[PDB]
Amino acid sequence: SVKIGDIDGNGEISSIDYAILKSHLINSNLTFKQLAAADVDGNGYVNSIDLAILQMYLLGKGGTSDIGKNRIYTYGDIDNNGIVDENDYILICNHINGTGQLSDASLFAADADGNNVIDQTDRILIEKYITGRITHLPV
Amino acid sequence: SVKIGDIDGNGEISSIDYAILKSHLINSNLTFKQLAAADVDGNGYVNSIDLAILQMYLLGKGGTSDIGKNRIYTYGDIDNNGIVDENDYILICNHINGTGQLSDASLFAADADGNNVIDQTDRILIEKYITGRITHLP
Numbered sequence: 711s712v713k714i715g716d717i718d719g720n721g722e723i724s725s726i727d728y729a730i731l732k733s734h735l736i737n738s739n740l741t742f743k744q745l746a747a748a749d750v751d752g753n754g755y756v757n758s759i760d761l762a763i764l765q766m767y768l769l770g771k772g773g774t775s776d777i778g779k780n781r782i783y784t785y786g787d788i789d790n791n792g793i794v795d796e797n798d799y800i801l802i803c804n805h806i807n808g809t810g811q812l813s814d815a816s817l818f819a820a821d822a823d824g825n826n827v828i829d830q831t832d833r834i835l836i837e838k839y840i841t842g843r844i845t846h847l848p849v
Numbered sequence: 850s851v852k853i854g855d856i857d858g859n860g861e862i863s864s865i866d867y868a869i870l871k872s873h874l875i876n877s878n879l880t881f882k883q884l885a886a887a888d889v890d891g892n893g894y895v896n897s898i899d900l901a902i903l904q905m906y907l908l909g910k911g912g913t914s915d916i917g918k919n920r921i922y923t924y925g926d927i928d929n930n931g932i933v934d935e936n937d938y939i940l941i942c943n944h945i946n947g948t949g950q951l952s953d954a955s956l957f958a959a960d961a962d963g964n965n966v967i968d969q970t971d972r973i974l975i976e977k978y979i980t981g982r983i984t985h986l987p
């Protein structure tokens with residue numbers, strides 16, 4: 711499960727989560743799972759606006775946000791429309807071929823073997839899943 | 850500062866906060882300030898619904914709530930209308946006299962000496978505050 715804002719993965723939202731995101735925005739260091747947790751506003755990309763929303767939440771000053779909620783994801787569902795199908799395959803293929811970069815927040819769903827790399831193995835697994843040759847993704 | 854759901858007052862919302870509130874609902878023990886923090890849904894009373902909302906939040910399953918937000922308190926402003934006047938005084942007097950009980954969440958605003966009791970001392974102190982004899986409630 712991915713908890714929005716829970717950058718260190720410990721299940722609770724704290725100033726350490728914020729510190730890790732702030733450091734990442736200076737020098738990238740977050741895993742795919744952390745990038746999914748870091749996309750506080752849900753627009754797919756991890757940036758200083760996400761950081762700001764997390765700051766306002768932690769200081770008690772925030773409006774309504776998804777911080778603390780479990781993020782809805784399905785492995786292989788890269789566009790997060792609730793189905794794994796050939797449009798998900800296209801997104802990962804273009805990513806691998808250099809003709810379209812996956813959003814920061816969708817890398818976790820694309821990483822079908824959970825090794826924090828997007829490569830041919832992920833594509834093949836999604837291909838097998840779509841065509842019914844495997845019942846689930848290994849992750 | 851009162852932060853909603855932050856029962857232990859450490860500035861963050863965690864499983865410890867839930868444990869303290871659950872313990873209180875079994876055997877009452879929260880301070881007035883903790884009661885203010887525990888009224889998650891803002892309805893004035895601290896009960897199992899507040900606990901349930903905190904539980905859902907900590908499991909990542911909650912809807913929209915005020916958990917984590919600061920709730921601004923003005924000492925002596927019992928009706929939360931932004932001024933301290935005779936109407937706040939009446940609310941504390943009735944409470945003391947047993948002719949109307951303050952909500953759990955307003956006890957912190959009424960407690961002029963911070964001893965987690967509302968008694969004749971809180972009445973005298975708000976009187977002095979309203980009439981300007983004391984510059985601020987202790």
Ligand SMILES: [Ca+2]
Pocket residue numbers: 715716717718719720721722723724727
């Ligand atoms: Ca955390």
Ligand SMILES: [Ca+2]
Pocket residue numbers: 748749750751752753754755756757760
């Ligand atoms: Ca974002």
Ligand SMILES: [Ca+2]
Pocket residue numbers: 786787788789790791792793794795797798
């Ligand atoms: Ca899809």
Ligand SMILES: [Ca+2]
Pocket residue numbers: 821822823824825826827828829831832
């Ligand atoms: Ca992979």
Ligand SMILES: [Ca+2]
Pocket residue numbers: 854855856857858859860861862863865866
């Ligand atoms: Ca706390």
Ligand SMILES: [Ca+2]
Pocket residue numbers: 887888889890891892893894895896899
């Ligand atoms: Ca309540």
Ligand SMILES: [Ca+2]
Pocket residue numbers: 925926927928929930931932933934936937
């Ligand atoms: Ca008032």
Ligand SMILES: [Ca+2]
Pocket residue numbers: 960961962963964965966967968970971
């Ligand atoms: Ca008192």
